[PDB]
Design a protein around this ligand. Sequence first.
Ligand SMILES: [O-][O-]
Ligand SMILES: [Cu+2]
Ligand SMILES: [Cu+2]
Ligand SMILES: [Cu+2]
Ligand SMILES: [Cu+2]
Length: 505
Amino acid sequence: TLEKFVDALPIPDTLKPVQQSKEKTYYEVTMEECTHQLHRDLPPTRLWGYNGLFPGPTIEVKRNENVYVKWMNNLPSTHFLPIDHTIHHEEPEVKTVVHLHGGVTPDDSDGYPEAWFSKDFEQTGPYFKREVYHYPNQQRGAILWYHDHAMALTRLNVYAGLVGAYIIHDPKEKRLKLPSDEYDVPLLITDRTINEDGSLFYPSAPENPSPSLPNPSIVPAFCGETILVNGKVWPYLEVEPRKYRFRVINASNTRTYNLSLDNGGDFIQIGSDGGLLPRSVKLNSFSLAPAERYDIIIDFTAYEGESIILANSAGCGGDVNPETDANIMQFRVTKPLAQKDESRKPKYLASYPSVQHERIQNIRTLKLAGTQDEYGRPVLLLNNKRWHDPVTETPKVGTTEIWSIINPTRGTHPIHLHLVSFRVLDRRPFDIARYQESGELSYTGPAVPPPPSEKGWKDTIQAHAGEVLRIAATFGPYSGRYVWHCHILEHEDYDMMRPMDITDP
Ligand SMILES: [O-][O-]
Ligand SMILES: [Cu+2]
Ligand SMILES: [Cu+2]
Ligand SMILES: [Cu+2]
Ligand SMILES: [Cu+2]
């Protein structure tokens, strides 16, 4: 097992524009097969990287900044990870498309799974319109991130290394004096399994595969043996004894983390997926499922000299192993102060989302279910529909709906809707055997309103087993063709994803 905390945390450089003016900012990002050492003791690992980097470069934009990105595929024509040809039915093997997660984006710049392109746009999927994506950024300051979304290949192209951070800065938040600049640090967390030769391992089949199974075969879940942050296995970060802001992004395929500091110190949560909370929240720990973001302050002022482990208590296919996946990274409070800490950790951050009083146009009830294929594998389905079935989720532009998500399965699914952020209304336990036998929904306890961490704006939300989760979303300001899906990539690809039409009457 790799020795923990021997590599310094990489800080991705901030991408420089190819062209910028006051009316427009223009970037170019090229997907490249590259090699990078992931740990002191490993040979360099072959990866797919935005601009040949893992993670990709951090993009930083201002609210309402008029941004264009030309995302280019300059990858090999063959993949290096195991492709299952039975999950989707002449197309190029390597297909890519960039989704800016949390982006308030016109539909043809949103990275629709069927808007894929091969190397140099030589072949393009049926929903492809444009090479240069347009991000108007007319939305709250928040932590976003970008990753590959290509139909039936997401779990592989993301696992290969196609992820990066994207920060929107709202200049009206500056007066809050949150830690900034070098004291504001993204933490992109990805679990990986790495072979002795340093090559990525991703399973070609379930363990002890029925001889029925195809080869390769998709697996329902991926749990990595090692944890990386910003592309290094279990790294350390040297910090000054003062306040830092961290943008924590879970960029893992399946794995959920439950994070804490091993010296018992607090996080101060200042933000969720959709931006600043109305009030900061002190937390001893927090759950973070794939695609969720936490915007937090950690105060190292009282901890000079100490080494503090960011620890993880959430299992993935089993309990955490204290020597490995119980560890994320280590902070070392040994860097001298560069200047007085002038940052703040204010209580009052933003307006409450509940100041809004929108009419409920529609209430959808959606179930998380599935079936078994001709090979005996589980196929995960939203409302027992396939991706290819005619669209059923058709909200009207400008209106607000409540979605009631029924989860009678054994696990949590982190549910994500494109375009919008939403409010969490409540969660409520129900009798699973009764639901499965009759389709009748019988509650076993009262509704539970969201904890303070879920009283801001969310875009990816944990829907736990044996519960009904209700959220409220306003669909806008764009109309068009989007998606909603589980953000466990192994579920998403087979087949837990649905189109979503936002209609203009
Ligand atoms: O990921 O959407
Ligand atoms: Cu995403
Ligand atoms: Cu998204
Ligand atoms: Cu799922
Ligand atoms: Cu998506």
